[PDB]
């Protein structure tokens, strides 16, 4: 089938379906995923307790 409108439409739908949770998070629980340790300016004389990547 032709991509348009079938998938152009289907993708635009899938865009809003995911975009909702993204925004919901980004806006209501902003730092839900970030380490609070990064609200402290880098300091070479204090190793954090648990250094782990994202």
């Amino acid at each position: 089938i032709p991509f348009h409108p079938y998938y152009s439409f289907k993708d635009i739908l899938g865009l809003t379906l995911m975009l909702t949770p993204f925004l919901t998070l980004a806006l209501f629980s902003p730092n839900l995923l970030g380490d609070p340790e990064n609200f402290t300016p880098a300091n070479p004389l204090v190793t954090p307790p648990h250094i782990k990547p994202e």
């Binding site: 032709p2 409108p5 079938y6």
Partner: protein
């Protein structure tokens, strides 16, 4: 002598109703030969699921002789007078007509009446024409153009009376009975629904007299002389795709619902199709043809042929187009076509219509080129319009059409409408109803 006058000077069409309700009409000319026949308001549409195809089976026996004079005799008697006997049957109209010298106008009329009123229906003949019709179906099955139009209806009027083929189902033809056929005739072939029309060197009176003489059968109850109105047929924007990459070319038909015989717009609609017109690889005009679609068709090798149409019916119709193309040029063709429909609705020119009109005028005039064609026009106008519309009139209605008018009507019938489409053959490149549906708006 101006066209204007040559029109006024066209003799009138005489119409008189007998007592049983039959209408006799005719146009007298100075011609030694003529065409007389009965045009009936019957056909597949009037059929049902169980008798679909009867009217056609009947057509197949109408000539195989009557009770008063069997096959051999009937045939021999007609051939021997040099008369030609022909007839047909469509969805809403059936007809049997004869071509002979005016001198035999009455003996003809007799014959006609004997055919519609006393068909033999010889039990033995049926079983033979049954094998015959069955053969005709197989031959017609290989005529893509009619297989397509059938499918077009099949879906454009899906689920209704009009969605049936004139010839009928295979089963229906394998089992129809002497009874069912008889019944069809006795139920449908009736005076109030018939018209004895004729044209040539015939005297209306000599005709109407010979009419009263052989078309007797007077009706008793009120039911017998009121013409039954048919339940309506619902249009449906939809598509049917019968694919077969094995066929050499593809056939495509697209249409919106039509207005129906009585509606005046039909004139403008025809004026419109006159603009788009038609093409076919043997038109020498080639790239200079006036029809934009035809040109593109030529400039870009878009197709083998194409035709616009305005098939009308009592209460509905089909306004669209059909084209035959090669598997790989279906899309461009379709694309361009829908383009023109859009042009009609949004940007028609006075220049365009002016021409379309002349082409249309010449058309109506040519529709009456001989006696059979005239008789066919009389037999129809009455049956459909309830009277006769003379070239003098048609012309006035056509002359009144202007751009601003063509636009409005086409818009009213084409713009943003869900169309019915039927494709047959190697149709892979033509695709998606959705896409086609959107080609229904914005120039």
């Amino acid at each position: 002598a101006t066209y204007a006058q040559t029109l006024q000077n066209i003799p009138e069409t005489n119409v008189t109703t007998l007592d049983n309700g039959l209408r006799v009409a005719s146009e007298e000319s100075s011609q030694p030969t003529c065409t007389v026949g009965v045009w009936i308001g019957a056909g597949s549409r009037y059929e049902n699921e169980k008798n679909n195809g009867a009217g056609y089976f009947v057509e197949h026996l109408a000539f195989k002789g009557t009770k008063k004079r069997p096959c051999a005799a009937f045939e021999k008697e007609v051939e021997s007078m040099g008369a030609h006997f022909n007839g047909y049957t469509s969805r809403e109209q059936t007809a049997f007509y004869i071509k002979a010298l005016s001198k035999d106008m009455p003996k003809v009329v007799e014959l006609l009446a004997d055919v519609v009123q006393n068909c033999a229906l010889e039990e033995s003949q049926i079983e033979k024409e049954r094998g015959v019709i069955l053969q005709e179906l197989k031959e017609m099955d290989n005529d893509m153009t009619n297989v397509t139009f059938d499918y077009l209806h099949a879906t454009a009027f899906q689920g209704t009376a009009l969605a049936r083929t004139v010839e009928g189902t295979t089963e229906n033809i394998k089992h129809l009975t002497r009874a069912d056929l008889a019944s069809y005739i006795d139920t449908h072939f009736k005076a109030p629904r018939m018209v004895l029309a004729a044209a040539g060197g015939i005297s209306h009176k000599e005709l109407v007299d010979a009419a009263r003489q052989h078309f007797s059968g007077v009706s008793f109850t009120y039911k017998e002389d009121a013409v039954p109105i048919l339940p309506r047929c619902r249009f449906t924007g939809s598509e049917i795709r019968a694919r077969d990459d094995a066929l050499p070319v593809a056939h495509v038909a697209l249409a919106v619902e039509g207005p129906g015989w009585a509606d005046p717009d039909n004139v403008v609609l025809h004026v419109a199709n006159a603009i788009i017109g038609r093409y076919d690889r043997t038109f020498g005009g080639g790239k200079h043809l006036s029809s934009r679609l035809a040109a593109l068709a030529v400039e870009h090798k878009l197709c083998h042929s194409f035709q616009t149409f305005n098939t009308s019916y009592s209460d509905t119709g089909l306004f669209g187009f059909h084209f035959v193309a090669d598997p790989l040029s279906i899309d461009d063709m379709m694309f361009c076509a829908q383009g023109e429909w859009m042009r009609l609705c949004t940007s028609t020119t006075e220049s365009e219509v002016k021409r379309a009109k002349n082409h249309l005028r010449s058309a109506m005039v040519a529709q009456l080129d001989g006696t059979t064609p005239v008789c066919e026009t009389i037999g129809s106008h009455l049956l459909n319009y309830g009277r006769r519309i003379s070239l003098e009139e048609w012309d006035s209605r056509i002359s009144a059409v202007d751009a601003r008018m063509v636009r409005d009507v086409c818009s009213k019938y084409i713009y943003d409408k869900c169309p019915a489409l039927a494709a047959v053959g190697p149709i892979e490149q033509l695709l998606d109803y959705n896409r086609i549906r959107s080609g229904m708006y914005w120039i």
